[PDB]
């Protein structure tokens, strides 16, 4: 069958950003329940099982724009590039920061999601398409194999 609302879709994909691959594998998701990033799900819409395709999905339809407000300078004294800090939220739900630069007392931190502001490039194979079982529809997600 073909990808649509309430189908469980199994894809084999590669993900590349700025020309470099960041991730790959096989996943199964329930289509039409906001389980995938919007742009990818849109690109999958209507595809027949067995289809292969590329899809460019811009930041606006993936992990959203990079909030320049999420970049801040914190004191070196406040800490206990590429540095990932899982520092405690102020009220709940921690937010991983990543340091981009540090000069003296000053440290530059970033609250944004890693892929924020990034256009994503996907190579995709639609491996299987079937209808969701009633349990999957209840939980609102795929129960793979």
């Amino acid at each position: 069958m073909k990808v649509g609302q309430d189908k469980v879709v199994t894809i084999r994909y590669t993900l590349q950003v700025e020309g470099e691959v960041l991730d790959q594998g096989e996943l199964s998701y329930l289509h039409g329940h906001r389980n995938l990033i919007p742009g990818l799900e849109e690109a999958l819409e209507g595809r027949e099982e067995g289809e292969a395709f590329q899809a460019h999905v811009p930041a606006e339809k993936a992990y959203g724009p990079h909030d320049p407000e999420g970049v801040q300078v914190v004191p070196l004294s406040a800490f206990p590039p590429g540095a990932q800090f899982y520092a405690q939220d102020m009220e709940g739900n921690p937010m991983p920061l990543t340091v981009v630069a540090v000069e003296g007392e000053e440290v530059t931190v970033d609250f944004n999601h890693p892929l924020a502001g990034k256009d994503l490039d996907f190579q995709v194979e639609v491996v299987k398409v079937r209808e969701a079982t009633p349990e999957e529809l209840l939980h609102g997600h795929a129960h793979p194999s």
């Binding site: 994909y13 996943l27 389980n35 995938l36 990033i37 990818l40």
Partner: peptide
């Protein structure tokens, strides 16, 4: 969410 996904790809994760």
């Amino acid at each position: 969410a996904l790809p994760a």
